[PDB]
Amino acid sequence: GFEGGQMPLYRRLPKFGFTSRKAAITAEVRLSDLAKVEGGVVDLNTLKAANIIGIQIEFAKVILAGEVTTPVTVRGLRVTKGARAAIEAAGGKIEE
Amino acid sequence: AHKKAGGSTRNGRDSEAKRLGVKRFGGESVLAGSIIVRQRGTKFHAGANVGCGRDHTLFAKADGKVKFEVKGPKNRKFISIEAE
Amino acid sequence: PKIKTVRGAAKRFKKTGKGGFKHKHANLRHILTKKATKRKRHLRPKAMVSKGDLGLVIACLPYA
Amino acid sequence: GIREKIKLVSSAGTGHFYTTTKNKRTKPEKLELKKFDPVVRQHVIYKEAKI
RNA sequence: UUUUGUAUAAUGGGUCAGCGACUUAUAUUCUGUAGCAAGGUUAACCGAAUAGGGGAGCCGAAGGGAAACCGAGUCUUAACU
RNA sequence: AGGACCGAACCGACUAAUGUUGAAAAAUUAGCGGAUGACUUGUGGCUGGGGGUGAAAGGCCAAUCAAACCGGGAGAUAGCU
RNA sequence: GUUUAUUAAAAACACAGCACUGUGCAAACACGAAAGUGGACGUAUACGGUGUGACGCCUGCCCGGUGCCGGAAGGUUAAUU
RNA sequence: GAACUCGCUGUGAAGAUGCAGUGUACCCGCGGCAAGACGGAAAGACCCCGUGAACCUUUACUAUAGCUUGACACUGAACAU
RNA sequence: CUUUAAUGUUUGAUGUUCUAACGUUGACCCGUAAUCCGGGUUGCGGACAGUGUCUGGUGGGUAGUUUGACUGGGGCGGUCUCCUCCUAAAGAGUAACGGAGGAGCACGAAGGUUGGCUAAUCCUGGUCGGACAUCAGGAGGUUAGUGCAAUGGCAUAAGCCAGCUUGACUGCGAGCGUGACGGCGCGAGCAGGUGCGAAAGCAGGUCAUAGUGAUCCGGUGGUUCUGAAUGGAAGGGCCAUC
Ligand SMILES: [Mg+2]
Numbered sequence: 001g002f003e004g005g006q007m008p009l010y011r012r013l014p015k016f017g018f019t020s021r022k023a024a025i026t027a028e029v030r031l032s033d034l035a036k037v038e039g040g041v042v043d044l045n046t047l048k049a050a051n052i053i054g055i056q057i058e059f060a061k062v063i064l065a066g067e068v069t070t071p072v073t074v075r076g077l078r079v080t081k082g083a084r085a086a087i088e089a090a091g092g093k094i095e096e
Numbered sequence: 097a098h099k100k101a102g103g104s105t106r107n108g109r110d111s112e113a114k115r116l117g118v119k120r121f122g123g124e125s126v127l128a129g130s131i132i133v134r135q136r137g138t139k140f141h142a143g144a145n146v147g148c149g150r151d152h153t154l155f156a157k158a159d160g161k162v163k164f165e166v167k168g169p170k171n172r173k174f175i176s177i178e179a180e
Numbered sequence: 181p182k183i184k185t186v187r188g189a190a191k192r193f194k195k196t197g198k199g200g201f202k203h204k205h206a207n208l209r210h211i212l213t214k215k216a217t218k219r220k221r222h223l224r225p226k227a228m229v230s231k232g233d234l235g236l237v238i239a240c241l242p243y244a
Numbered sequence: 245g246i247r248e249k250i251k252l253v254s255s256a257g258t259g260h261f262y263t264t265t266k267n268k269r270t271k272p273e274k275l276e277l278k279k280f281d282p283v284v285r286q287h288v289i290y291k292e293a294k295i
Numbered sequence: 296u297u298u299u300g301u302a303u304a305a306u307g308g309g310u311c312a313g314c315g316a317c318u319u320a321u322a323u324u325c326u327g328u329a330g331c332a333a334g335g336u337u338a339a340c341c342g343a344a345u346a347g348g349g350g351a352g353c354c355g356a357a358g359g360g361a362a363a364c365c366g367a368g369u370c371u372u373a374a375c376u
Numbered sequence: 377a378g379g380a381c382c383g384a385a386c387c388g389a390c391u392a393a394u395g396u397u398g399a400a401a402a403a404u405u406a407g408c409g410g411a412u413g414a415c416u417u418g419u420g421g422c423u424g425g426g427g428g429u430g431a432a433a434g435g436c437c438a439a440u441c442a443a444a445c446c447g448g449g450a451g452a453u454a455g456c457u
Numbered sequence: 458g459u460u461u462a463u464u465a466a467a468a469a470c471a472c473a474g475c476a477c478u479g480u481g482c483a484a485a486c487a488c489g490a491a492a493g494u495g496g497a498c499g500u501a502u503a504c505g506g507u508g509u510g511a512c513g514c515c516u517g518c519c520c521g522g523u524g525c526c527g528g529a530a531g532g533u534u535a536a537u538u
Numbered sequence: 539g540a541a542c543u544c545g546c547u548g549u550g551a552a553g554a555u556g557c558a559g560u561g562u563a564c565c566c567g568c569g570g571c572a573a574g575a576c577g578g579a580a581a582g583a584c585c586c587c588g589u590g591a592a593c594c595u596u597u598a599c600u601a602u603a604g605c606u607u608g609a610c611a612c613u614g615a616a617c618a619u
Numbered sequence: 620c621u622u623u624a625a626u627g628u629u630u631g632a633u634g635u636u637c638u639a640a641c642g643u644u645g646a647c648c649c650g651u652a653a654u655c656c657g658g659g660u661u662g663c664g665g666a667c668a669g670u671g672u673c674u675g676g677u678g679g680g681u682a683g684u685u686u687g688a689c690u691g692g693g694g695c696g697g698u699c700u701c702c703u704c705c706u707a708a709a710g711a712g713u714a715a716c717g718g719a720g721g722a723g724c725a726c727g728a729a730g731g732u733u734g735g736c737u738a739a740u741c742c743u744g745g746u747c748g749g750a751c752a753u754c755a756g757g758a759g760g761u762u763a764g765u766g767c768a769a770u771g772g773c774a775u776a777a778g779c780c781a782g783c784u785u786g787a788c789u790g791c792g793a794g795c796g797u798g799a800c801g802g803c804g805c806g807a808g809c810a811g812g813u814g815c816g817a818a819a820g821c822a823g824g825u826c827a828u829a830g831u832g833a834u835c836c837g838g839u840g841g842u843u844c845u846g847a848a849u850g851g852a853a854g855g856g857c858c859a860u861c
Pocket residue numbers: 005
């Protein structure tokens with residue numbers, strides 16, 4: 001980063017933002033990783049046992065990526081608008 | 097050895113060049129909003145499909161070809177854009 | 181041993197989708213009465229890093 | 245040099261303000277103008293106040 | 296050798312034989328090559344096993360925003376052609 | 377009587393010549409200053425390094441002094457040859 | 458009389474004499490984290506520091522600047538509460 | 539560094555034994571003299587440079603031993619203002 | 620509320636006297652064959668002196684350091700950022716301790732719009748009045764005027780006078796110019812809400828080009844953000860500003 005004595009680029013620019021502690025205990029789940037659990041019920045505890053999310057994740061979100069081809073059940077997780085349609089088209093259910 | 101090193105001068109300074117002049121010449125195809133000439137005062141005047149900025153910059157207001165001509169009772173110089 | 185990040189570069193640059201970096205514009209902390217609104221409005225969004233500067237940024241953030 | 249900075253405060257109660265300069269020695273009166281308030285989205289009356 | 300430029304009256308060497316200067320460790324990126332591939336690979340450790348076990352972890356498969364949050368979109372704005 | 381006078385031993389070091397890979401890392405030869413005093417000398421002792429000692433020249437402290445010598449930090453650092 | 462041991466012996470240092478100033482004795486002052494020691498087994502006709510330098514005739518005017526000595530009515534002012 | 543190691547006028551990193559042109563000169567010692575080999579000796583001490591060093595000064599900066607002021611502790615009792 | 624004396628209460632201080640802490644490098648006895656030391660008796664001082672923690676002043680006595688670069692060698696003198704003209708070779712750019720000058724502001728109107736006007740200088744006539752004041756006519760044609768240097772512009776005036784006014788407005792922005800970069804500049808059009816005009820239309824400061832200072836650290840106002848067990852708060856982020 002030394003430029004000869006001229007004020008360097010990483011110091012003539014300003015700092016911005018802050019780091020959020022909630023974002024480190026949150027994860028996202030794909031549709032293609034949704035039949036890799038055992039039991040047909042997709043849940044926070046069953047996703048950890050399948051090595052899909054980390055041990056200290058407390059929130060999860062199912063997004064539209066890949067394909068789902070079996071009927072599954074989702075409880076306690078958040079689902080996007082486009083992933084809610086793909087799950088229900090296969091014959092699934094979503095519960096709070 | 098003897099040495100005589102004189103006195104000093106009270107000139108010595110100037111200001112930065114400003115890159116004025118003509119940017120697009122006659123017959124060139126330009127897009128709307130392009131700058132054609134930069135000037136101090138109106139050495140050229142705005143014609144058809146050409147605007148004048150706050151510092152007398154002339155810029156295109158349509159798509160076409162640059163055109164120079166002389167018109168009027170004072171034999172003045174104009175730029176216009178002829179529709180492409 | 182492991183390389184150490186330049187901790188002051190990490191507070192000023194963030195990586196994007198194709199591998200570039202974004203930063204915040206300068207000249208907006210101070211002395212704001214005498215500047216025009218058109219000028220201050222154009223310094224509010226974020227900007228990308230230019231080609232000549234990328235080599236200096238990449239050396240300072242080896243784990244980004 | 246002699247002009248000094250002031251602010252004009254909105255009378256719509258939104259807390260919005262502008263900034264400008266003024267020499268108090270020749271024009272000791274208070275400045276008052278109509279300006280756009282972007283919080284309520286109307287032209288209202290602004291009045292002088294200190295920095 | 297150093298220089299714009301050296302037969303230089305610029306520097307170094309009396310001669311011979313022996314020795315005498317880009318290495319090692321860890322991290323990171325790029326290139327060639329090999330394996331397996333929407334997956335790849337284990338560390339400490341256990342084990343007589345250069346075998347076998349151990350998947351704790353790490354990288355990749357999704358991004359935008361300061362963030363809450365949304366999500367093939369997202370941010371900016373009262374709203375965007 | 378005397379920090380009196382001339383002058384050997386003894387203590388010094390003003391001038392010139394020689395010597396300058398010397399007989400000698402400070403001498404020899406011819407003259408020169410003090411020579412009962414603030415004199416000179418043997419043996420033992422005390423003061424230690426930002427310290428000592430100095431009738432004071434930055435002088436002396438083992439042929440070393442505007443900060444001794446020995447060992448360690450130590451392969452200090454050297455945009456210079 | 459002393460001085461740059463080893464390129465300078467002098468008009469340089471010292472000196473008897475003169476002045477200013479500090480010190481009442483568990484003295485001032487110096488060496489010591491301290492205990493102690495010198496000053497001194499002394500006591501203002503004594504001891505320390507500074508300048509000048511036998512002797513003779515002498516040592517003029519300036520307290521605005523800087524430093525020291527004395528004063529304590531008023532202004533400003535620490536910890537503390 | 540190696541040598542089979544002459545003069546002059548020109549040239550040329552600008553003052554030539556060695557380059558060009560030209561003049562002179564059989565091979566090898568011994569005693570002498572110092573005009574040249576930019577002769578030997580010591581990585582110029584003058585001058586400049588390096589965001590080098592050391593020691594000295596002061597009403598440069600920032601600290602600090604010492605000296606000095608007050609509050610609290612060791613620390614108590616009467617009485618009058 | 621004040622004006623005065625004390626009762627009682629609260630201490631804050633300045634003085635004398637005392638002895639019991641503490642001091643004694645006064646005298647005497649013992650350990651003891653001892654000018655150290657300790658214990659005992661007495662005299663003299665006495666809550667002073669002195670020491671610990673905290674604190675204001677002084678402090679080359681000692682210590683660590685700093686004390687720019689350009690430059691027809693260094694020092695001395697001059698200079699260091701920004702604007703205008705020439706050198707500069709008819710696109711842009713172009714050096715020297717080359718040749719000549721300026722800036723570090725001003726203005727709520729000197730900004731916007733609608734309507735309307737046109738200068739310098741000279742000549743002749745005219746009370747005071749004169750070389751030059753105000754009045755009338757003629758010639759001339761921008762030789763004037765621009766808030767401030769110089770250059771390029773300006774009559775459809777950008778120059779001069781009036782009525783009404785706050786567009787010196789908020790969110791954006793096709794496309795271009797100039798820079799190694801950080802950055803700086805010009806811009807039609809779109810959404811919301813204004814002003815002037817009967818309308819077509821003009822208006823996001825000023826004829827244009829100088830009038831300036833990064834980041835860090837903090838201060839003020841507002842906030843659909845965050846908030847270390849939980850509800851708050853402190854602190855942080857974002858927007859406006861110093
Ligand atoms: Mg600098």
